[PDB]
Design a binder for this molecule. Structure first.
Ligand SMILES: Nc1nc2c(ncn2[C@H]2C[C@H](O)[C@@H](COP(=O)(O)OP(=O)(O)OP(=O)(O)O)O2)c(=O)[nH]1
Ligand SMILES: [Mg+2]
Length: 522
DNA sequence: CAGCTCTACGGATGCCTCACA
DNA sequence: TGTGAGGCATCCGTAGA
Protein backbone atom coordinates (compact mmCIF):
# COMPACT_ATOMS: atom_id res chain seq x y z
CA UNK A 1 0.00 0.00 0.00
CA UNK A 2 2.83 2.35 -0.92
CA UNK A 3 1.96 6.04 -1.29
CA UNK A 4 4.15 7.92 -3.76
CA UNK A 5 5.04 11.51 -2.88
CA UNK A 6 8.05 13.80 -2.59
CA UNK A 7 9.03 12.34 0.79
CA UNK A 8 9.68 8.78 -0.44
CA UNK A 9 10.22 9.32 -4.17
CA UNK A 10 13.22 7.10 -4.92
CA UNK A 11 12.70 6.58 -8.69
CA UNK A 12 13.31 2.86 -8.13
CA UNK A 13 9.58 2.10 -8.33
CA UNK A 14 9.71 2.72 -12.08
CA UNK A 15 11.83 -0.44 -12.34
CA UNK A 16 8.68 -2.35 -11.35
CA UNK A 17 7.02 -1.11 -14.54
CA UNK A 18 9.63 -2.86 -16.69
CA UNK A 19 8.39 -6.05 -18.39
CA UNK A 20 4.82 -6.05 -17.08
CA UNK A 21 1.51 -7.05 -18.69
CA UNK A 22 -1.41 -6.29 -16.34
CA UNK A 23 -2.12 -3.23 -14.21
CA UNK A 24 -5.53 -2.83 -12.58
CA UNK A 25 -5.61 0.95 -12.87
CA UNK A 26 -8.48 2.66 -11.05
CA UNK A 27 -8.51 6.36 -10.16
CA UNK A 28 -10.35 8.43 -7.55
CA UNK A 29 -11.52 12.03 -7.69
CA UNK A 30 -13.53 14.69 -5.86
CA UNK A 31 -16.71 14.38 -7.94
CA UNK A 32 -18.10 13.36 -11.34
CA UNK A 33 -17.63 16.32 -13.68
CA UNK A 34 -14.54 16.28 -15.88
CA UNK A 35 -14.13 20.02 -16.57
CA UNK A 36 -14.65 21.07 -12.94
CA UNK A 37 -12.63 18.61 -10.82
CA UNK A 38 -9.23 16.91 -10.58
CA UNK A 39 -7.77 13.50 -9.80
CA UNK A 40 -7.04 12.89 -6.11
CA UNK A 41 -5.72 9.30 -6.01
CA UNK A 42 -4.52 7.07 -8.85
CA UNK A 43 -4.33 3.41 -7.82
CA UNK A 44 -2.32 0.86 -9.81
CA UNK A 45 -2.40 -2.84 -8.89
CA UNK A 46 0.44 -5.14 -9.97
CA UNK A 47 0.50 -8.91 -9.53
CA UNK A 48 2.51 -10.22 -6.55
CA UNK A 49 2.81 -6.67 -5.19
CA UNK A 50 0.57 -4.42 -3.07
CA UNK A 51 -1.55 -1.75 -4.71
CA UNK A 52 0.42 1.46 -5.23
CA UNK A 53 -1.19 4.89 -4.88
CA UNK A 54 -0.30 8.28 -6.29
CA UNK A 55 -1.66 11.55 -4.87
CA UNK A 56 -1.56 14.57 -7.18
CA UNK A 57 -2.39 17.21 -4.55
CA UNK A 58 1.04 17.13 -2.86
CA UNK A 59 3.51 16.26 -5.64
CA UNK A 60 4.40 19.24 -7.84
CA UNK A 61 6.72 19.91 -10.80
CA UNK A 62 7.82 17.17 -13.21
CA UNK A 63 10.21 14.17 -13.23
CA UNK A 64 8.06 12.26 -10.71
CA UNK A 65 5.25 11.30 -13.11
CA UNK A 66 7.61 9.65 -15.59
CA UNK A 67 7.10 5.92 -15.07
CA UNK A 68 3.32 6.22 -14.83
CA UNK A 69 3.04 8.27 -18.03
CA UNK A 70 5.41 5.89 -19.83
CA UNK A 71 3.32 2.89 -18.78
CA UNK A 72 0.07 4.62 -19.73
CA UNK A 73 1.26 5.66 -23.20
CA UNK A 74 2.69 2.19 -23.90
CA UNK A 75 0.61 0.11 -26.31
CA UNK A 76 2.11 -3.24 -25.23
CA UNK A 77 0.71 -3.06 -21.66
CA UNK A 78 -2.98 -3.54 -20.92
CA UNK A 79 -4.88 -1.16 -18.63
CA UNK A 80 -7.70 -2.83 -16.70
CA UNK A 81 -10.14 -0.02 -15.88
CA UNK A 82 -13.39 -0.66 -14.02
CA UNK A 83 -16.08 1.24 -15.92
CA UNK A 84 -13.36 2.59 -18.17
CA UNK A 85 -15.48 5.43 -19.52
CA UNK A 86 -15.10 7.83 -16.57
CA UNK A 87 -11.55 7.12 -15.38
CA UNK A 88 -10.25 7.10 -18.96
CA UNK A 89 -12.15 10.34 -19.58
CA UNK A 90 -10.32 12.01 -16.70
CA UNK A 91 -6.97 10.59 -17.82
CA UNK A 92 -7.38 11.83 -21.39
CA UNK A 93 -8.80 15.19 -20.31
CA UNK A 94 -5.43 16.41 -19.02
CA UNK A 95 -1.96 15.95 -20.56
CA UNK A 96 -2.02 12.18 -20.05
CA UNK A 97 -2.08 9.60 -22.85
CA UNK A 98 -3.78 6.24 -22.28
CA UNK A 99 -3.97 3.25 -24.62
CA UNK A 100 -5.06 -0.40 -24.53
CA UNK A 101 -8.06 0.12 -22.26
CA UNK A 102 -9.81 -3.07 -21.12
CA UNK A 103 -13.14 -2.67 -19.31
CA UNK A 104 -14.62 -5.45 -17.21
CA UNK A 105 -18.00 -3.68 -17.39
CA UNK A 106 -18.17 -3.90 -21.19
CA UNK A 107 -17.17 -7.57 -21.11
CA UNK A 108 -19.74 -8.29 -18.39
CA UNK A 109 -22.48 -6.63 -20.43
CA UNK A 110 -21.62 -9.02 -23.30
CA UNK A 111 -22.75 -12.05 -21.29
CA UNK A 112 -26.03 -13.92 -20.98
CA UNK A 113 -9.82 -7.35 -7.59
CA UNK A 114 -9.29 -6.15 -11.16
CA UNK A 115 -6.45 -8.63 -11.77
CA UNK A 116 -8.70 -11.63 -11.13
CA UNK A 117 -11.59 -9.99 -12.99
CA UNK A 118 -9.54 -9.58 -16.17
CA UNK A 119 -8.91 -13.33 -16.33
CA UNK A 120 -12.46 -14.23 -15.28
CA UNK A 121 -13.78 -12.11 -18.17
CA UNK A 122 -11.21 -12.87 -20.88
CA UNK A 123 -11.45 -16.64 -20.42
CA UNK A 124 -15.26 -16.51 -20.54
CA UNK A 125 -15.34 -14.32 -23.66
CA UNK A 126 -12.80 -16.57 -25.39
CA UNK A 127 -14.86 -19.69 -24.64
CA UNK A 128 -17.87 -18.01 -26.29
CA UNK A 129 -16.16 -16.79 -29.49
CA UNK A 130 -16.93 -13.19 -28.51
CA UNK A 131 -13.30 -12.07 -28.67
CA UNK A 132 -13.71 -10.05 -31.88
CA UNK A 133 -16.58 -7.90 -30.63
CA UNK A 134 -15.02 -7.49 -27.19
CA UNK A 135 -11.75 -6.31 -28.74
CA UNK A 136 -13.63 -3.91 -31.01
CA UNK A 137 -15.55 -2.42 -28.08
CA UNK A 138 -12.48 -2.14 -25.84
CA UNK A 139 -10.56 -0.35 -28.59
CA UNK A 140 -13.66 1.78 -29.23
CA UNK A 141 -13.68 3.01 -25.62
CA UNK A 142 -11.10 5.65 -26.55
CA UNK A 143 -13.08 7.05 -29.53
CA UNK A 144 -16.10 7.38 -27.21
CA UNK A 145 -14.02 9.37 -24.74
CA UNK A 146 -12.73 11.55 -27.58
CA UNK A 147 -16.31 12.26 -28.67
CA UNK A 148 -17.29 13.15 -25.11
CA UNK A 149 -14.28 15.43 -24.61
CA UNK A 150 -14.64 17.29 -27.90
CA UNK A 151 -18.41 17.52 -27.99
CA UNK A 152 -19.99 19.64 -30.70
CA UNK A 153 -20.10 23.43 -30.98
CA UNK A 154 -23.41 25.25 -31.49
CA UNK A 155 -24.24 28.18 -33.79
CA UNK A 156 -26.03 29.99 -30.98
CA UNK A 157 -27.12 33.00 -33.05
CA UNK A 158 -28.92 30.87 -35.64
CA UNK A 159 -30.34 28.67 -32.87
CA UNK A 160 -31.91 31.59 -30.99
CA UNK A 161 -33.21 33.27 -34.15
CA UNK A 162 -34.85 30.00 -35.18
CA UNK A 163 -36.26 29.51 -31.67
CA UNK A 164 -37.92 32.93 -31.81
CA UNK A 165 -39.27 32.16 -35.29
CA UNK A 166 -40.68 28.80 -34.21
CA UNK A 167 -42.20 30.42 -31.12
CA UNK A 168 -44.02 32.93 -33.31
CA UNK A 169 -45.20 30.22 -35.70
CA UNK A 170 -46.45 28.05 -32.83
CA UNK A 171 -48.28 31.06 -31.38
CA UNK A 172 -50.08 31.79 -34.64
CA UNK A 173 -50.91 28.11 -35.16
CA UNK A 174 -52.28 27.85 -31.62
CA UNK A 175 -54.46 30.89 -32.29
CA UNK A 176 -55.73 29.39 -35.55
CA UNK A 177 -56.47 26.02 -33.93
CA UNK A 178 -58.29 27.61 -30.99
CA UNK A 179 -60.38 29.76 -33.34
CA UNK A 180 -61.22 26.74 -35.51
CA UNK A 181 -62.19 24.48 -32.61
CA UNK A 182 -64.54 27.13 -31.17
CA UNK A 183 -63.64 26.00 -27.63
CA UNK A 184 -60.82 28.26 -26.37
CA UNK A 185 -60.90 26.34 -23.07
CA UNK A 186 -59.05 23.06 -23.82
CA UNK A 187 -55.32 22.34 -23.65
CA UNK A 188 -54.35 21.31 -27.18
CA UNK A 189 -51.58 19.16 -25.67
CA UNK A 190 -54.15 16.80 -24.09
CA UNK A 191 -54.95 14.11 -26.65
CA UNK A 192 -57.78 12.62 -24.58
CA UNK A 193 -59.71 15.90 -24.85
CA UNK A 194 -58.77 17.15 -28.32
CA UNK A 195 -59.96 13.83 -29.75
CA UNK A 196 -63.35 14.47 -28.11
CA UNK A 197 -63.31 18.02 -29.46
CA UNK A 198 -62.74 16.59 -32.93
CA UNK A 199 -65.56 14.09 -32.43
CA UNK A 200 -67.97 16.88 -31.44
CA UNK A 201 -67.24 18.80 -34.63
CA UNK A 202 -68.46 16.36 -37.32
CA UNK A 203 -65.06 15.06 -38.43
CA UNK A 204 -65.10 11.55 -39.90
CA UNK A 205 -63.63 9.52 -42.72
CA UNK A 206 -65.20 9.47 -46.18
CA UNK A 207 -66.11 5.85 -45.35
CA UNK A 208 -68.42 6.98 -42.51
CA UNK A 209 -65.77 6.25 -39.87
CA UNK A 210 -65.44 8.61 -36.91
CA UNK A 211 -62.09 9.71 -35.49
CA UNK A 212 -60.78 7.21 -32.93
CA UNK A 213 -57.01 7.71 -32.64
CA UNK A 214 -55.07 10.89 -33.40
CA UNK A 215 -51.89 9.10 -34.50
CA UNK A 216 -50.53 10.72 -37.64
CA UNK A 217 -50.87 7.43 -39.53
CA UNK A 218 -54.57 7.27 -38.62
CA UNK A 219 -54.82 11.06 -38.69
CA UNK A 220 -53.95 11.22 -42.40
CA UNK A 221 -56.67 8.72 -43.34
CA UNK A 222 -59.32 11.11 -41.98
CA UNK A 223 -58.25 14.12 -44.05
CA UNK A 224 -60.67 16.18 -46.24
CA UNK A 225 -61.82 17.95 -43.06
CA UNK A 226 -60.51 21.46 -42.44
CA UNK A 227 -59.48 20.60 -38.88
CA UNK A 228 -56.97 17.73 -39.19
CA UNK A 229 -54.51 19.90 -41.12
CA UNK A 230 -54.44 22.35 -38.21
CA UNK A 231 -53.90 19.58 -35.66
CA UNK A 232 -51.05 18.01 -37.64
CA UNK A 233 -49.32 21.34 -38.29
CA UNK A 234 -49.55 22.52 -34.71
CA UNK A 235 -48.37 19.15 -33.34
CA UNK A 236 -45.36 19.20 -35.67
CA UNK A 237 -44.49 22.78 -34.74
CA UNK A 238 -45.01 22.11 -31.04
CA UNK A 239 -42.68 19.12 -31.09
CA UNK A 240 -40.04 21.00 -33.10
CA UNK A 241 -40.25 23.78 -30.50
CA UNK A 242 -40.61 22.13 -27.10
CA UNK A 243 -38.84 18.81 -27.64
CA UNK A 244 -35.51 20.26 -28.79
CA UNK A 245 -35.42 24.01 -29.45
CA UNK A 246 -36.24 25.04 -25.88
CA UNK A 247 -34.15 22.29 -24.28
CA UNK A 248 -31.00 22.72 -26.39
CA UNK A 249 -29.49 25.85 -24.75
CA UNK A 250 -30.04 24.33 -21.29
CA UNK A 251 -27.67 21.44 -22.09
CA UNK A 252 -24.70 23.60 -23.17
CA UNK A 253 -21.79 23.57 -20.74
CA UNK A 254 -20.58 27.01 -19.70
CA UNK A 255 -17.21 28.57 -20.62
CA UNK A 256 -17.07 26.28 -23.68
CA UNK A 257 -20.42 26.82 -25.47
CA UNK A 258 -20.23 23.20 -26.65
CA UNK A 259 -22.80 20.43 -26.18
CA UNK A 260 -21.09 17.59 -24.31
CA UNK A 261 -23.54 14.72 -24.67
CA UNK A 262 -23.33 11.29 -23.05
CA UNK A 263 -22.65 8.29 -25.28
CA UNK A 264 -23.65 4.77 -24.23
CA UNK A 265 -22.17 1.64 -25.78
CA UNK A 266 -24.44 -1.20 -24.62
CA UNK A 267 -27.73 0.39 -23.50
CA UNK A 268 -29.36 -0.54 -26.83
CA UNK A 269 -30.59 -4.07 -27.46
CA UNK A 270 -28.96 -4.49 -30.88
CA UNK A 271 -25.66 -2.85 -29.92
CA UNK A 272 -26.28 0.60 -31.43
CA UNK A 273 -25.52 3.91 -29.69
CA UNK A 274 -27.84 5.59 -27.17
CA UNK A 275 -27.31 9.26 -26.28
CA UNK A 276 -29.20 9.68 -22.99
CA UNK A 277 -28.43 13.41 -22.84
CA UNK A 278 -29.24 15.92 -25.57
CA UNK A 279 -29.92 13.50 -28.39
CA UNK A 280 -27.76 14.77 -31.21
CA UNK A 281 -28.90 11.57 -32.94
CA UNK A 282 -32.52 12.79 -32.93
CA UNK A 283 -31.98 16.19 -34.56
CA UNK A 284 -34.59 16.63 -37.33
CA UNK A 285 -33.33 15.43 -40.64
CA UNK A 286 -34.05 18.71 -42.29
CA UNK A 287 -30.78 20.56 -42.84
CA UNK A 288 -32.20 23.85 -41.54
CA UNK A 289 -31.94 22.45 -38.00
CA UNK A 290 -28.60 20.64 -38.18
CA UNK A 291 -27.02 23.76 -39.72
CA UNK A 292 -26.71 25.05 -36.13
CA UNK A 293 -23.84 22.63 -35.33
CA UNK A 294 -20.43 23.90 -36.40
CA UNK A 295 -16.69 23.23 -36.19
CA UNK A 296 -14.25 25.09 -34.02
CA UNK A 297 -12.86 28.07 -35.90
CA UNK A 298 -10.39 27.42 -38.74
CA UNK A 299 -11.19 23.69 -38.64
CA UNK A 300 -13.48 21.59 -40.85
CA UNK A 301 -15.51 18.38 -40.67
CA UNK A 302 -15.37 15.16 -42.67
CA UNK A 303 -18.70 13.30 -42.82
CA UNK A 304 -19.23 9.74 -44.04
CA UNK A 305 -22.52 7.87 -44.46
CA UNK A 306 -22.91 4.23 -45.48
CA UNK A 307 -24.58 3.72 -48.86
CA UNK A 308 -27.47 1.31 -48.27
CA UNK A 309 -25.64 -0.63 -45.58
CA UNK A 310 -28.72 -2.72 -44.89
CA UNK A 311 -30.09 -5.08 -47.54
CA UNK A 312 -26.38 -5.77 -48.10
CA UNK A 313 -25.92 -7.55 -44.79
CA UNK A 314 -29.27 -9.15 -45.60
CA UNK A 315 -28.01 -10.10 -49.06
CA UNK A 316 -24.92 -11.81 -47.63
CA UNK A 317 -26.86 -13.51 -44.83
CA UNK A 318 -29.40 -14.81 -47.37
CA UNK A 319 -26.87 -15.70 -50.09
CA UNK A 320 -29.43 -14.20 -52.47
CA UNK A 321 -27.84 -14.44 -55.91
CA UNK A 322 -30.07 -11.85 -57.59
CA UNK A 323 -29.50 -9.32 -54.80
CA UNK A 324 -25.71 -9.59 -55.05
CA UNK A 325 -25.86 -9.52 -58.85
CA UNK A 326 -27.89 -6.30 -58.70
CA UNK A 327 -25.50 -4.82 -56.14
CA UNK A 328 -22.60 -5.51 -58.50
CA UNK A 329 -24.55 -3.46 -61.07
CA UNK A 330 -24.86 -0.43 -58.73
CA UNK A 331 -28.65 -0.09 -58.60
CA UNK A 332 -30.47 1.03 -55.46
CA UNK A 333 -32.94 -1.44 -53.98
CA UNK A 334 -34.79 1.44 -52.33
CA UNK A 335 -35.07 3.27 -55.64
CA UNK A 336 -36.34 0.08 -57.30
CA UNK A 337 -38.99 -0.56 -54.64
CA UNK A 338 -39.91 3.09 -55.10
CA UNK A 339 -40.26 3.06 -58.89
CA UNK A 340 -42.23 -0.21 -58.87
CA UNK A 341 -45.07 1.52 -56.99
CA UNK A 342 -44.81 5.31 -57.31
CA UNK A 343 -44.28 8.02 -59.92
CA UNK A 344 -42.96 6.24 -62.99
CA UNK A 345 -39.32 5.92 -64.06
CA UNK A 346 -36.29 5.43 -61.79
CA UNK A 347 -34.53 8.84 -61.93
CA UNK A 348 -37.68 10.70 -60.74
CA UNK A 349 -37.21 9.56 -57.11
CA UNK A 350 -36.62 12.34 -54.58
CA UNK A 351 -35.58 12.16 -50.92
CA UNK A 352 -39.10 11.68 -49.56
CA UNK A 353 -39.83 9.00 -52.18
CA UNK A 354 -36.58 7.26 -51.30
CA UNK A 355 -37.48 7.45 -47.60
CA UNK A 356 -40.95 5.94 -47.96
CA UNK A 357 -39.49 3.25 -50.22
CA UNK A 358 -36.87 2.62 -47.53
CA UNK A 359 -39.69 2.12 -45.06
CA UNK A 360 -41.47 -0.29 -47.41
CA UNK A 361 -38.32 -2.31 -48.13
CA UNK A 362 -37.40 -2.73 -44.48
CA UNK A 363 -41.03 -3.48 -43.62
CA UNK A 364 -41.46 -6.36 -46.05
CA UNK A 365 -37.87 -7.57 -45.64
CA UNK A 366 -38.56 -7.86 -41.90
CA UNK A 367 -42.17 -8.99 -42.30
CA UNK A 368 -44.66 -6.25 -43.22
CA UNK A 369 -47.71 -7.84 -44.85
CA UNK A 370 -49.54 -6.72 -47.97
CA UNK A 371 -52.60 -5.17 -46.29
CA UNK A 372 -50.52 -3.17 -43.82
CA UNK A 373 -48.29 -2.33 -46.78
CA UNK A 374 -51.37 -1.15 -48.68
CA UNK A 375 -52.33 1.06 -45.75
CA UNK A 376 -48.81 2.48 -45.51
CA UNK A 377 -48.53 3.18 -49.24
CA UNK A 378 -52.01 4.72 -49.39
CA UNK A 379 -51.42 6.94 -46.36
CA UNK A 380 -47.93 8.12 -47.31
CA UNK A 381 -48.61 8.20 -51.06
CA UNK A 382 -51.58 9.21 -53.19
CA UNK A 383 -51.80 5.90 -55.04
CA UNK A 384 -55.34 4.82 -54.12
CA UNK A 385 -53.97 1.34 -54.83
CA UNK A 386 -56.36 -1.60 -54.50
CA UNK A 387 -55.73 -4.67 -52.34
CA UNK A 388 -55.39 -7.13 -55.23
CA UNK A 389 -52.71 -5.06 -56.97
CA UNK A 390 -50.84 -4.79 -53.68
CA UNK A 391 -51.00 -8.55 -53.14
CA UNK A 392 -49.69 -9.14 -56.66
CA UNK A 393 -46.82 -6.70 -56.07
CA UNK A 394 -45.98 -8.35 -52.74
CA UNK A 395 -45.89 -11.79 -54.35
CA UNK A 396 -43.84 -10.45 -57.26
CA UNK A 397 -41.19 -9.05 -54.92
CA UNK A 398 -41.11 -12.17 -52.76
CA UNK A 399 -40.64 -14.42 -55.82
CA UNK A 400 -38.15 -12.14 -57.61
CA UNK A 401 -35.70 -12.44 -54.69
CA UNK A 402 -35.91 -16.18 -54.13
CA UNK A 403 -33.24 -16.10 -51.44
CA UNK A 404 -35.26 -13.60 -49.42
CA UNK A 405 -38.32 -15.87 -49.56
CA UNK A 406 -36.32 -18.96 -48.62
CA UNK A 407 -34.77 -17.11 -45.68
CA UNK A 408 -38.22 -16.01 -44.53
CA UNK A 409 -39.32 -19.64 -44.72
CA UNK A 410 -36.48 -21.08 -42.65
CA UNK A 411 -36.72 -18.37 -40.00
CA UNK A 412 -40.47 -18.97 -39.77
CA UNK A 413 -40.08 -22.73 -39.30
CA UNK A 414 -37.21 -22.61 -36.80
CA UNK A 415 -37.90 -21.53 -33.21
CA UNK A 416 -34.41 -21.75 -31.73
CA UNK A 417 -34.83 -18.37 -29.95
CA UNK A 418 -31.03 -17.86 -30.17
CA UNK A 419 -29.82 -15.33 -32.73
CA UNK A 420 -26.56 -13.68 -33.74
CA UNK A 421 -24.95 -11.24 -36.16
CA UNK A 422 -21.85 -11.57 -38.33
CA UNK A 423 -19.58 -10.90 -35.32
CA UNK A 424 -21.15 -13.59 -33.09
CA UNK A 425 -23.02 -11.06 -30.92
CA UNK A 426 -25.30 -13.72 -29.45
CA UNK A 427 -28.75 -12.89 -28.06
CA UNK A 428 -31.33 -15.02 -26.24
CA UNK A 429 -34.81 -13.83 -27.17
CA UNK A 430 -37.60 -14.17 -24.58
CA UNK A 431 -40.14 -15.30 -27.18
CA UNK A 432 -40.03 -16.03 -30.90
CA UNK A 433 -40.91 -12.77 -32.65
CA UNK A 434 -40.72 -13.12 -36.43
CA UNK A 435 -39.87 -9.53 -37.35
CA UNK A 436 -37.62 -9.02 -34.32
CA UNK A 437 -35.77 -12.19 -35.29
CA UNK A 438 -35.27 -10.99 -38.86
CA UNK A 439 -34.25 -7.51 -37.72
CA UNK A 440 -31.67 -8.34 -35.02
CA UNK A 441 -28.88 -9.74 -37.26
CA UNK A 442 -28.75 -6.97 -39.85
CA UNK A 443 -28.77 -4.05 -37.40
CA UNK A 444 -26.35 -5.82 -35.06
CA UNK A 445 -23.89 -6.31 -37.92
CA UNK A 446 -24.34 -2.67 -38.93
CA UNK A 447 -23.51 -1.56 -35.39
CA UNK A 448 -20.45 -3.83 -35.26
CA UNK A 449 -19.21 -2.45 -38.58
CA UNK A 450 -19.66 1.07 -37.22
CA UNK A 451 -17.72 0.27 -34.04
CA UNK A 452 -14.81 -1.26 -35.94
CA UNK A 453 -14.79 1.72 -38.30
CA UNK A 454 -14.52 4.03 -35.29
CA UNK A 455 -11.72 1.95 -33.79
CA UNK A 456 -9.64 2.11 -36.96
CA UNK A 457 -10.53 5.78 -37.46
CA UNK A 458 -9.11 6.76 -34.08
CA UNK A 459 -6.12 4.44 -34.41
CA UNK A 460 -5.28 5.96 -37.82
CA UNK A 461 -5.93 9.72 -37.49
CA UNK A 462 -3.14 10.08 -34.90
CA UNK A 463 -0.75 11.37 -37.58
CA UNK A 464 -2.78 14.52 -38.40
CA UNK A 465 -4.33 15.25 -34.98
CA UNK A 466 -7.77 13.89 -35.82
CA UNK A 467 -10.77 14.19 -33.52
CA UNK A 468 -14.16 12.47 -33.78
CA UNK A 469 -17.25 14.36 -32.67
CA UNK A 470 -20.42 12.43 -33.54
CA UNK A 471 -21.65 8.98 -34.58
CA UNK A 472 -25.34 8.29 -35.32
CA UNK A 473 -25.94 4.55 -35.85
CA UNK A 474 -24.11 4.37 -39.17
CA UNK A 475 -22.64 7.84 -39.88
CA UNK A 476 -19.28 9.15 -38.68
CA UNK A 477 -18.23 12.80 -38.64
CA UNK A 478 -14.80 14.01 -37.55
CA UNK A 479 -12.75 17.19 -37.17
CA UNK A 480 -9.37 17.77 -38.80
CA UNK A 481 -7.40 20.94 -39.44
CA UNK A 482 -8.29 22.23 -42.89
CA UNK A 483 -4.67 21.77 -44.02
CA UNK A 484 -5.25 17.98 -44.15
CA UNK A 485 -8.92 17.82 -45.22
CA UNK A 486 -8.42 15.68 -48.35
CA UNK A 487 -6.21 13.25 -46.45
CA UNK A 488 -8.89 13.00 -43.75
CA UNK A 489 -11.47 12.13 -46.42
CA UNK A 490 -9.28 9.29 -47.68
CA UNK A 491 -8.63 8.29 -44.05
CA UNK A 492 -12.34 7.89 -43.36
CA UNK A 493 -12.86 5.88 -46.55
CA UNK A 494 -10.11 3.46 -45.55
CA UNK A 495 -11.53 3.44 -42.02
CA UNK A 496 -14.93 2.19 -43.21
CA UNK A 497 -14.41 0.04 -46.32
CA UNK A 498 -11.71 -2.08 -44.67
CA UNK A 499 -14.00 -2.49 -41.67
CA UNK A 500 -16.77 -3.62 -44.01
CA UNK A 501 -14.38 -6.06 -45.71
CA UNK A 502 -13.79 -7.69 -42.32
CA UNK A 503 -17.47 -8.70 -42.22
CA UNK A 504 -18.99 -8.59 -45.73
CA UNK A 505 -17.01 -10.68 -48.22
CA UNK A 506 -19.27 -10.88 -51.29
CA UNK A 507 -20.67 -7.36 -51.84
CA UNK A 508 -18.31 -4.37 -51.88
CA UNK A 509 -19.66 -1.75 -49.49
CA UNK A 510 -19.58 1.91 -50.46
CA UNK A 511 -19.51 5.08 -48.37
CA UNK A 512 -20.56 8.62 -49.25
CA UNK A 513 -17.88 11.08 -48.09
CA UNK A 514 -18.32 14.85 -47.93
CA UNK A 515 -16.49 17.98 -46.83
CA UNK A 516 -18.80 19.82 -44.46
CA UNK A 517 -18.96 23.25 -42.88
CA UNK A 518 -21.86 21.98 -40.75
CA UNK A 519 -23.53 18.87 -39.40
CA UNK A 520 -26.45 19.74 -41.69
CA UNK A 521 -24.70 20.07 -45.05
CA UNK A 522 -24.31 16.30 -45.05
C1' DC B 1 -53.73 -15.43 -32.70
C1' DA B 2 -49.45 -11.97 -36.16
C1' DG B 3 -46.91 -8.90 -37.32
C1' DC B 4 -41.44 -3.30 -39.53
C1' DT B 5 -37.40 -2.98 -35.59
C1' DC B 6 -34.21 -0.25 -31.69
C1' DT B 7 -33.89 3.82 -28.55
C1' DA B 8 -34.93 8.39 -25.67
C1' DC B 9 -38.25 12.08 -23.98
C1' DG B 10 -42.10 15.57 -23.13
C1' DG B 11 -46.61 15.72 -21.04
C1' DA B 12 -51.47 14.33 -19.26
C1' DT B 13 -53.59 11.04 -15.36
C1' DG B 14 -55.24 7.74 -11.31
C1' DC B 15 -52.73 5.86 -7.01
C1' DC B 16 -50.16 6.42 -2.83
C1' DT B 17 -48.87 8.78 1.19
C1' DC B 18 -49.44 11.81 5.08
C1' DA B 19 -50.93 15.55 7.87
C1' DC B 20 -53.44 18.53 11.26
C1' DA B 21 -56.45 20.49 14.44
C1' DT C 1 -63.61 17.04 7.72
C1' DG C 2 -61.47 19.52 4.26
C1' DT C 3 -58.17 20.03 0.42
C1' DG C 4 -53.92 19.56 -1.28
C1' DA C 5 -49.53 19.46 -3.19
C1' DG C 6 -46.44 16.53 -4.79
C1' DG C 7 -44.60 12.78 -6.96
C1' DC C 8 -45.06 8.84 -9.82
C1' DA C 9 -45.66 5.10 -12.93
C1' DT C 10 -48.56 4.72 -17.83
C1' DC C 11 -49.80 5.75 -22.24
C1' DC C 12 -49.71 9.04 -26.98
C1' DG C 13 -47.22 10.78 -30.01
C1' DT C 14 -43.32 11.96 -32.79
C1' DA C 15 -37.92 12.22 -33.26
C1' DG C 16 -34.33 9.64 -35.27
C1' DA C 17 -31.89 5.88 -37.61
N1 LIG D 1 -36.50 -1.08 -39.73
C1 LIG D 1 -36.35 0.15 -40.24
N2 LIG D 1 -35.14 0.70 -40.28
C2 LIG D 1 -35.16 1.94 -40.82
C3 LIG D 1 -36.24 2.65 -41.29
N3 LIG D 1 -35.85 3.89 -41.76
C4 LIG D 1 -34.55 3.92 -41.56
N4 LIG D 1 -34.07 2.76 -41.01
C5 LIG D 1 -32.68 2.51 -40.64
C6 LIG D 1 -32.20 1.07 -40.63
C7 LIG D 1 -30.72 1.18 -41.00
O1 LIG D 1 -29.89 0.76 -39.93
C8 LIG D 1 -30.51 2.66 -41.25
C9 LIG D 1 -29.57 2.98 -42.36
O2 LIG D 1 -29.38 4.40 -42.40
P1 LIG D 1 -30.25 5.22 -43.46
O3 LIG D 1 -31.54 5.62 -42.83
O4 LIG D 1 -29.42 6.34 -44.01
O5 LIG D 1 -30.50 4.11 -44.59
P2 LIG D 1 -29.64 3.22 -45.60
O6 LIG D 1 -28.21 3.31 -45.21
O7 LIG D 1 -30.27 1.89 -45.75
O8 LIG D 1 -29.82 4.04 -46.96
P3 LIG D 1 -28.89 5.19 -47.56
O9 LIG D 1 -28.02 4.52 -48.57
O10 LIG D 1 -28.11 5.77 -46.43
O11 LIG D 1 -29.82 6.17 -48.19
O12 LIG D 1 -31.82 3.15 -41.57
C10 LIG D 1 -37.53 2.06 -41.25
O13 LIG D 1 -38.60 2.54 -41.62
N5 LIG D 1 -37.48 0.78 -40.69
MG1 LIG E 1 -26.80 5.57 -44.28
Amino acid sequence: FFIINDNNYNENINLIYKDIKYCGLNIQTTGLEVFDENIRLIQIAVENYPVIIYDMFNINKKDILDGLRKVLENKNIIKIIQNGKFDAKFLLHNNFKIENIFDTYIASKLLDCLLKLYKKLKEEIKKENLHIVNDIENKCILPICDMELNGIKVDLENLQKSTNEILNELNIEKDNLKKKLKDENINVNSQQQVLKALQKNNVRDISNKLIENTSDSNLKNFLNHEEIISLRNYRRLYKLYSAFYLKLPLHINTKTNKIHTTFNQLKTFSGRFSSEKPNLQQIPRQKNIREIFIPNDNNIFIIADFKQIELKIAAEITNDEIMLKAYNNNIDLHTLTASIITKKNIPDINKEDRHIAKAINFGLIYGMNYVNLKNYANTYYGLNMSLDQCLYFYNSFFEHYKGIYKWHNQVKQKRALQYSTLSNRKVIFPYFSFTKALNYPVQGTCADILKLALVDLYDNLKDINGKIILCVHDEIIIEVNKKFQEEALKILVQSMENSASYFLKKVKCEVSVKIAENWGSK
